[PDB]
Structures are given as structure tokens and as C-alpha cells.
Design a protein around this nucleic acid. Structure first.
Lengths: 172, 136, 106, 197, 97, 191
RNA sequence: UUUGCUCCACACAAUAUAGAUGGAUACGAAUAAGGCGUCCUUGUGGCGUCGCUGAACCAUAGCAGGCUAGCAACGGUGCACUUGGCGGAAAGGCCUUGGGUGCUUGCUGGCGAAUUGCAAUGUCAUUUUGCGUGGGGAUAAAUCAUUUGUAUACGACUUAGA
RNA sequence: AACUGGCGAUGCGGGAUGAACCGAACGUAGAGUUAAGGUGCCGGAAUACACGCUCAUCAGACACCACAAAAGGUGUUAGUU
């Protein structure tokens, strides 16, 4: 829907005198805003415990920025989702350099190819993919291939106005 | 023994192709392909262009056929190192089409009195075309 | 000395329908080939002369002219409109017209 | 630059042609169209004639002719598409309508002009490749638009003829290109070369 | 409410109008074939309704009923003069006909 | 799932010379010549050195492969025609009524008398698809010899020639006669 | 049936613009292309070449274009004659001989301009008709009323009539 | 039958069409600005741009609002075990 960050929503569900400072538990949200990063943080918090949104307290937040982003990677993705019929789990594999890109392409794939809508989809895990043997997906193996170099058939252009003076060629 | 094939082959791709960045902030700068990302995007860097170690939609960059060698998976010192092996921009400079862009550019660089001189140089140039072609 | 034009041409489109009903004082004006809206701030205020040659004469000529100027843009490509002493007869749709270079900032 | 615009119609789109072509004449635009037998649609040859039979049954009851009418000229077949893409019934809209000509083939008054095409409406371009299409005067003559072979011969004669005119032309203009290729190194060409050339 | 039955009805539909139709002399909608492998040949001829009578002649279709027999025949007889050839027109052969 | 470079890789022998006009091939064999419109495949055709030619599709598709394999099959069929050429032998069946079979001539049209077609006073007559070239299979009842250069030159001729004797009107899952096939072969046999 | 009617030159009036105001400036084929050079046996051969813009090209000074001189050159132009060929799809246009004429802002002269006064288009296409000059040609056909029947409510069809 | 909201009694902007639906209610006006609702043509306003599905011998093109199932299909696509 938009771009997301690598947040860090740290929460300590409210201190008592019996327990001052329960133990500052974080989540690493991938959200646009810290706001709905926290709303979804709590949305996973009631899943965790007998809590609700006023029942506790959030320590902190850090969009986890990247001191070395220049290393292109591969990625492993586990999914909890609800379809129109079958709510399931998945695993697929995405080459990227950031995880949020795999989110965007993920929901173009699932919104487009399984018509999956986000408000009942919960991504389990990205254990990113490191080596050549770490790959199930043949389409990822197609980029585990070697030295694909080739011409481009059927190049197109755009007309200046609406015409040419000519029926042109689709040479590259 | 013929098996003569005519066409269906044009500008190739590679990792390490200095390409013409056909749009964007470069909109015509040049960048070696560091890496392929997918069929839609590749990792590139034009350090000669100064443009970073970065990606672009392959439908949003255009090719050169102007290959050069590149150790894949390398940082910018190695990249512009290979550009130092590949001082090569002289050669799409040797493409007349970039020089045609310089031509329509320099067409867009006239004063009106200079342009009046262009008229009278059609008159005297083309007068000498009409004495190169008066009787001849 | 061979091409005696010194203005900007243009073609009357219509008056604006918001969706349905025309705005029969507020036009739709065709610019002479500009889709780049960024040029316009100098041009805003340049006049418009519509020559029409009726066989009836006025105090001076049979060549009588309705005028305008450039105000501000519209749409996804920067389309401007005009200012009428006399509005058009809801008929001028695709008529050519003059657009000038004065009042010049230069 | 052309008040009347000479256009060849070889292998193009139809509704995407005629919706913005329907936008064209609104400006007072005057266009002549030649070779009106050379058009294709994304969609197979099979179903479409049958669809014309599906349209073909529509008429007013108590006089079965006076309803919609049915014709075989591929230009007017094209105006069946175009009519619902225009406002074809005013002094305004009809005044726009009256500024257009379409021709099956290229008449000898029109051999003397050049021919242009539109890439947006070009059939090979807006094409997810793997689609079928239809030859226009083929399907028209197959329902009975019988007059195809006459101008099929005539356009052979005159494309032959302007090809000979072209042999004169291209064979001539090389000798022109030699004839002032010899004009290399004039200092005025150095100057104007430095001025934009 | 379909009527009661099905039945053949009247008339034929490749003939209309039944107005006072075209002219005193009638139209022609097809012609015998030109063959330029052949000499100068023509298409038809015109006559005048002169009379009709009953005329005797044979019949010899084998297997049929009056094989090796004669009948009488209600014939019709035309008037025929010779006619004078005076003109020729070329017809430029157009993509409209 | 869009396999990234699809192709057919066909060895060329040396009795043959072709010429691919940018998709359009000029096939020449020791028997004769073929061509094909191959401007319905959109490949780059690929001579290497008179001993293999590929096709080339950058990133071919799934059903594109489902036809693109047998692209090679039908090409090699054309090789066997343009070099070697097919030569089938068919069958005839009657049981009670002796069907006369003849390549009767109608002006080189080469029809076929089919007489006593189960008591029929009606006669069948089958013209010869030319190109595929037919002699009577001598010394064998109810056979004949076709010899062409496409597998449908001879099996389309055998297909609709097979469709000559589509016999009706009886309990034909019991009543079994007609033009059948025996054999498929080669113009140069052992080639 | 004004010497009527109707063609050529006029001038003058009338006379309207669905929208002038440097130039619409011609092969064919192909698109997983060929194009055009280039060379050669001429081939589905040899070399280039080219994209990625027509942003092409032509054309470009003067009273919307002024008068007026002198230079190299020997153009290029119209004009209206003259020569030849071609065009049916709607050809109705295309190309070709010869004469003259104008210019040349390709090189050097003399001029010349205002006051529309600070904006006020400050007015340059055909549109048709009339008339009049002074150059032509032509010397009708219908109806009604009579008559035919095959033609018909009537209209309307079809014959004849010095 | 128990709650809220409109017509009635009330017009304007979106649903081709619509008593009770989407926006928003009513002095005369004018300068800037939008909802509802949209920007192939009519049609104002982008044949704007990005990622994918699909090819339909019966696609598809929607609150209001003006409609199919059981059962299937080596059709496709992708995965899951």
C-alpha cells in the first residue's frame, strides 16, 4: 500500500510495585508509521497475553536503519494468511536487498495471484537465504544461474506527436 | 554449405555493461551493471557518472552494446577501477547520435544575429552550392 | 520578411462543462502545442485577438476582433483560458486566434 | 502542417484508433484516409462475422427494413465503430463529422502524396503477442463486398509505378548525395557546424 | 399463444414490390457468358406476343409414360423482325462496378 | 514459468543448403527443396556452421515449449522429406463384394474407381493428391504405395483417403470393410 | 421569345467565409528488421551503414518588401509562347523542346523613411452575382387543348396529329 | 412489533434511469477551494506512470443497482504435503 521501515517497538506491560519494569519486550515492526506499528504491536500483544491496549506500556521505538545496505541478498518467507476458503501457512523465497521490497512484491503476488487481502494475513518469518543450496524455488534457481547475456527482440519507442512519417522497425 | 541466418540479433546484455540510463536523475548518464537482480531490475553503478551502487527498472534503462569486463560482486573502487580499465565513453562519443544530440543542442545555442549569419551562410554557402552546381 | 506572423496561434475548444453544463462565459482554450505547464507564469496576461471579417463595417474597418489574455492553467497538461469583453457565440469551436507577447516582463 | 492529412491504414487498431481519431476532427481537422482494406483487430477471424450476423437481425417490426441498416463498405463498417465514439448529431458535432475522407485503396489523385501511420493505433504495437486478427476486405468480400480485386490490381499497378518512380528517386538522390558529398570542408560548414550542425 | 397448427402460407418474397412496377420494358439481372476464346456473340433477343395455339408432335423418353407416342402441345408463338445495329459504348470497369 | 532462454538445436547434414531470410528459410535437400513461412514463431534462427541451427526465444513460455519442442519434430519431418521422403502402403477390405480399384485418369487428376462397393451401383472415385506419388502395390492384394515428402502429404492423403470408406447403414461395429492402411515407408527406402 | 440566349478580355459594384496568412515536401517489402550505400560470380553472396527522431529538408533581408548605381560570374528564377511524352480509379494531372524576359540580398554605391505620435488588426483569400466595355458562338424544347389503348376511381401510364 | 435516519414538508453535486440511496441542504452576488463522484470517445479531466493475472466458439467492465447453484474441467497460474 506504501513503503515500510524496519521499526523496533519495545514494550514493558505496565509496571506495578510488585513488578516495577516488566522486561521491556520488543518487536521489530515493518511499517510506515510508528503509530500503526504500535497498533499492530498491540494487535499481536493481545494474541500473546491477557492484555489490552491500555493494560500495558511501550518502552521505545527504533527504526532499525542500516549501516551497510550495499550487500544484495536472498530471502526466506513463512506466511500465516487467510484466504477466501483456506487459511494456511506458506514458505516462498525472494531475492532482495531489503525485506520491505519482498513485502511489496509479496502482496502484489498474493493480492494479484491469489487475490489475498492483507487484513487477515500475518507474515511469520523471514529467514533470509544465504547459499546456493538454501533454495527450493526454481525461479530463484534461475537467478542462481550463470551469465545470461542476450539481445532484445521487439524494441518499442514512443511517437513524438502521434505519428511517424514511417512504419518503423522493432530492432533494438 | 549455407545455413545463412539474416537478422533477429541486436544489442546484447551483460553484467558490467555500461548502459545509457535512459531516464531519471541521470537521464542519460552511463553506468556499469554490477549485478543482475531479476528480469525487471539489475544492480548498477556509474562511478564515472558518480551515480551510486543502485538498481533500476530494466524497462526504465536502455542499453548500450558497449560491453566491458567486470568482476561481479565488487565495490566502487573495483568498479571505477574497471572503468579505469574502461575509459570508453569516447566511443558513444564516437556514436554520431550522441553527437547529434550535441548538434540539436548547438542548434539550440544560437543568437538571432548568429542565426541571421546562418541564413546568409545558406545564401553564400548555398550560393557556392549553386556555383558548384551552377553549370556543374 | 517572408513569414509575416509574430504571435501565438490557438484554437477555441469550448466553454467548460464541469461535467455537464457549459460555462458559457468561461472557456476551454487550445494552446499552440504546449503540454509543459511550467512555462506559463510569463505568459499569464498575454492578450488574444480574434479577427473575424464580417461584411458589415464598424467605425474604421470590416475586420473586427474579440480579445482575451492568459490567466492560469487547468488539467494534467496545463491548459489556460481567456477573458472576454464579449463572450463567444458558443460556436467558435476550433477557430484560430492570436495570442501575443505583451504585456512583456521584458 | 497538413491541413488535409493523407494517411495509410495498414494493419492498425480500431476502437483505440477511432476514439482519439474521434477526438481529432473536433478541432476542425481534415484528414484523408487511403487503403481502407488493411485493418486488423485483436481477436480471431472466426467469431466476428458471426457477431455481424448477430447484429444483422435487428430491425423495426411493422416495416422490417426501416430499422438499422446493413452495409459492406469497410469504411462504413468502420463508422459503425466510430459512430458511438462521437457526438455525431449536432451543428457542432456534424460540423466536425463533415471534415473527413476514407478510401479503399489509393486513387491516382492520391498517389502523388506521402503516407503516415500512428504507433498508438498500430496493431503490432498494442499487442500481447499471441493474438489473432482479421484481414478487412477479405472478411468484407467474404460476406459479399465483391469489388476488392479491381483496386487490388490497381494498387499493384501504382505501387509498381511509384516503385519505378522510386527507382528514379533513390537511384537519383545517391548521385545528389555524391553530387554535394564533394562539398566537404567549406569553412561555412565549419562555422554552421559549430553553430548547430 | 401459438395458433393451432403449422401450414404453408402464400406468396414469394424475391419479387417485391407489387406496386405499379418498373416500366413498360423490363429489366435484365443476369446475362449469358462472354468468352473471348469465341467470335462475336451476343446475349439475347426481343420479340412480340403474336399468338398461341395447340401443336401436335412426338414423345420418346424411354422409361417414361408416353415413350414412342405423340401428344399435342399448347405452344406460344412470337413475332420477330430483323433489327438494325447502329451503336457501341465502352464501359470503364470501376471498383464500384 | 518463463524459462529464460528456449531454443531448438538441430544438427544439419551436408547434402542440404537452406537460407533463412531473417525468419524465412530456403530449404534444399538431396531430394529437393522445401520452405516455410516461419514468421509465426518470432525466434532468432541460428546457423552455427552448416551442422546445427537453433531457434531463439529470449525467455520462452510454458505452452510455448509445449509447441516449441515439436517445432523440432516437424522440422525433422521436413528434413526427412527434403532428403529422403515417405512412402506408405495402405489396405483395402471387402469380404463378399469384390471392389475394383483403379487409378482411373481424369486428365492427370488420377481418380480411383472403387467398384462393387458392397453391391453399390454407385462408384467411388478418388483423385490423387499430387506430390505424394502412388503406384499400385503389385503382388499383394488390397495394397497400394504412396510416396511423398510430408507426413501429411502421405498421412493426410491416407487420412482422408482413409475417410473415403467411412461406411454407414449397417451394424458396422460388426460390418467391417474399407480402405485401411498397411505400412509407412520411405521414397528412398532404407532412408 | 428587346438581336434575344450563350462563351473571351475587362472594370465597377454587390458578394459570404464551422474558420488563408513561408512550404502537404509521393516506392514497395520486413518486423525474432531490414534499409541504403558499397563490391563481386550476383547470391537469401562482400563490405560498410543506420537508428535510439521531422529537431528532416526546402525557403528565407528591401515601400508585407522601395528606388538606384558600379564587381566576379554566366547561374537561378518567373512570365507567356513553343516541343515532346505519359496519365481512367476520379485519368484531368504528370514529365519534355526552344525563345525571351526579371532578379540575384553572391561583391562594392547613392538614397529613402518620421507624426499612427505611449497600445488601438490599424485592413494583402475566394465567395458569387450584376453591369459595361469589346472579342465569340448558337438559331430550341415542352405543356395545355385534340387522338391511341394495352391505361386508369382520380391523379398517373401509353399512341397519333401541317 | 422495539432503535436511528429521510420523504412527506426539500432543493443542489454522484449512481445512463431512479420519493426515502453517496456528498452536501437553500439571501443576492463575485474572487480563490473541494466533497460525492470521477479523468479512451461522447467526457470536463491523464490511451499518466508501477507490479502481476487472464484470452473468454458463452471474458470482463461492480455500494445503491437492477443476480446462478450442486456438480465438475491433465485449462491456466502459483504454492502445500
Amino acid at each position: 500500500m506504501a513503503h515500510f521501515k524496519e521499526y523496533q517497538v519495545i514494550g514493558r506491560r505496565l509496571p506495578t510495585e510488585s513488578v516495577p519494569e516488566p522486561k521491556l519486550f520488543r518487536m521489530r515492526i515493518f511499517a510506515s508509521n510508528e503509530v500503526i506499528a504500535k497498533s499492530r504491536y498491540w494487535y499481536f500483544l493481545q494474541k500473546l497475553h491477557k492484555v489490552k491496549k491500555a493494560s500495558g506500556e511501550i518502552v521505545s521505538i527504533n527504526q532499525i536503519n542500516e549501516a551497510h545496505p550495499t550487500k544484495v541478498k536472498n530471502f526466506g518467507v513463512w506466511v500465516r494468511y487467510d484466504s477466501r476458503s483456506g487459511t494456511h501457512n506458506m514458505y516462498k523465497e525472494i531475492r532482495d536487498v531489503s525485506r520491505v521490497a519482498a513485502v511489496e512484491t509479496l502482496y502484489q503476488d498474493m493480492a494479484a495471484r491469489h487475490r489475498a487481502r492483507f487484513r487477515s494475513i500475518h507474515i511469520l518469518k523471514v529467514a533470509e537465504i544465504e547459499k546456493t543450496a538454501d533454495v527450493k524455488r526454481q525461479y530463484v534457481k534461475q537467478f542462481l544461474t550463470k551469465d545470461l547475456k542476450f539481445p532484445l527482440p521487439h524494441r518499442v519507442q514512443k511517437s513524438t506527436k502521434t505519428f511517424s512519417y514511417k512504419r518503423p522497425s522493432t530492432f533494438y | 554449405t549455407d545455413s545463412i541466418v539474416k537478422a533477429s540479433n541486436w544489442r546484447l546484455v551483460e553484467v558490467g555493461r555500461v548502459v545509457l540510463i535512459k531516464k531519471g536523475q541521470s537521464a542519460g548518464k552511463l553506468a556499469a551493471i554490477v549485478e543482475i537482480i531479476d528480469q525487471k531490475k539489475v544492480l548498477i553503478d556509474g562511478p564515472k557518472a558518480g551515480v551510486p551502487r543502485q538498481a533500476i527498472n530494466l524497462g526504465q534503462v536502455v542499453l548500450t552494446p558497449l560491453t566491458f569486463a567486470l568482476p561481479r560482486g565488487a565495490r566502487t573502487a573495483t568498479v571505477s577501477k574497471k572503468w579505469a580499465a574502461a575509459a570508453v565513453c569516447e566511443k558513444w562519443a564516437a556514436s554520431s547520435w550522441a553527437k547529434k544530440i550535441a548538434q540539436r543542442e548547438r542548434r539550440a545555442a544560437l543568437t538571432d544575429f548568429e542565426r541571421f549569419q546562418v541564413m546568409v551562410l545558406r545564401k553564400q554557402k548555398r550560393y557556392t552550392v549553386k556555383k558548384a552546381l551552377a553549370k556543374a | 520578411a517572408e513569414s509575416h506572423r509574430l504571435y501565438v496561434k490557438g484554437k477555441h475548444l469550448s466553454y467548460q462543462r464541469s461535467k455537464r453544463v457549459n460555462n458559457p462565459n468561461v472557456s476551454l482554450i487550445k494552446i499552440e502545442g504546449v503540454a509543459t505547464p511550467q512555462d506559463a507564469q510569463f505568459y499569464l496576461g498575454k492578450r488574444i485577438a480574434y479577427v473575424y471579417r464580417a461584411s458589415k463595417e464598424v467605425r474604421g474597418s470590416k475586420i473586427r476582433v474579440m480579445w482575451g489574455k492568459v490567466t492560469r492553467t487547468h488539467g494534467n497538461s496545463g491548459v489556460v483560458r481567456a477573458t472576454f469583453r464579449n463572450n463567444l457565440p458558443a460556436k467558435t469551436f476550433g477557430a484560430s486566434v492570436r495570442i501575443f507577447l505583451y504585456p512583456s516582463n521584458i | 502542417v497538413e491541413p488535409v492529412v493523407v494517411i495509410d491504414g495498414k494493419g492498425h487498431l480500431v476502437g483505440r484508433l477511432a476514439s482519439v481519431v474521434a477526438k481529432q476532427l473536433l478541432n476542425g481537422q481534415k484528414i484523408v484516409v487511403v487503403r481502407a482494406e488493411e485493418l486488423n483487430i485483436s481477436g480471431e477471424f472466426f467469431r466476428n462475422k458471426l457477431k455481424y450476423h448477430d447484429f444483422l437481425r435487428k430491425a423495426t417490426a411493422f416495416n422490417k427494413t426501416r430499422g438499422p441498416f446493413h452495409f459492406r463498405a469497410p469504411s462504413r463498417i468502420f463508422y459503425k465503430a466510430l459512430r458511438g465514439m462521437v457526438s455525431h448529431k449536432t451543428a457542432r458535432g456534424k460540423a466536425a463529422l463533415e471534415r473527413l475522407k476514407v478510401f479503399e485503396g489509393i486513387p491516382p489523385p492520391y498517389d502523388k502524396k506521402k503516407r503516415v501511420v500512428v504507433p498508438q493505433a498500430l496493431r503490432v504495437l498494442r499487442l500481447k503477442p499471441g493474438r489473432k486478427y482479421t484481414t478487412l476486405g477479405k472478411l468484407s468480400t467474404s460476406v459479399g463486398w465483391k469489388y476488392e480485386d479491381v483496386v487490388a490490381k490497381l494498387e499493384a499497378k501504382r505501387k509498381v509505378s511509384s516503385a519505378e518512380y522510386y527507382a528514379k528517386k533513390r537511384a537519383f538522390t545517391k548521385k545528389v548525395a555524391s553530387a554535394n558529398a564533394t562539398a566537404a570542408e567549406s569553412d561555412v560548414a565549419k562555422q554552421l557546424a559549430a553553430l548547430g550542425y | 399463444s401459438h395458433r393451432k397448427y403449422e401450414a404453408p402460407r402464400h406468396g414469394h418474397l424475391g419479387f417485391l414490390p407489387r406496386k405499379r412496377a418498373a416500366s413498360i420494358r423490363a429489366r435484365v439481372k443476369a446475362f449469358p457468358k462472354d468468352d473471348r476464346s469465341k467470335p462475336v456473340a451476343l446475349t439475347s433477343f426481343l420479340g412480340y406476343k403474336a399468338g398461341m395455339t395447340t401443336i401436335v408432335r412426338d414423345l420418346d423418353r424411354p422409361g417414361s409414360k408416353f415413350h414412342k407416342r405423340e401428344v399435342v402441345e399448347a405452344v406460344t408463338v412470337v413475332d420477330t423482325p430483323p433489327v438494325v445495329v447502329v451503336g457501341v459504348v465502352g464501359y470503364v470497369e470501376t471498383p464500384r462496378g | 514459468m518463463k524459462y529464460i532462454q528456449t531454443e531448438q538445436q538441430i544438427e544439419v547434414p551436408e547434402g542440404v543448403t537452406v537460407s533463412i531470410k531473417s525468419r524465412i528459410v530456403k530449404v534444399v535437400g538431396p531430394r529437393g527443396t522445401l520452405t516455410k513461412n516461419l514468421k509465426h514463431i518470432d525466434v532468432t534462427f541460428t546457423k552455427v556452421n552448416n551442422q546445427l541451427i537453433k531457434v531463439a526465444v529470449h525467455n520462452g513460455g510454458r505452452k510455448h515449449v509445449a509447441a516449441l519442442r515439436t517445432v523440432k519434430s516437424l522440422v525433422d519431418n521436413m528434413i526427412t522429406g527434403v532428403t529422403k521422403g515417405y512412402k506408405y502402403k495402405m489396405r483395402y477390405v471387402y469380404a463378399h463384394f469384390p471392389i475394383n480399384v483403379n487409378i482411373v485418369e481424369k486428365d492427370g487428376a488420377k481418380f480411383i474407381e472403387v467398384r462393387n462397393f458392397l453391391g453399390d451401383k454407385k462408384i467411388r472415385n478418388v483423385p490423387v493428391r499430387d506430390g505424394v506419388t502412388i503406384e499400385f502395390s503389385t503382388n499383394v492384394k488390397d495394397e497400394i504405395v504412396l510416396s511423398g515428402n510430408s507426413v501429411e502429404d502421405v498421412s493426410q492423403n491416407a487420412a482422408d483417403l482413409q475417410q473415403i470408406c467411412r461406411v454407414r447403414n449397417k451394424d458396422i461395429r460388426k460390418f467391417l470393410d474399407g480402405i485401411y492402411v498397411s505400412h509407412k515407408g520411405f521414397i528412398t527406402e532404407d532412408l
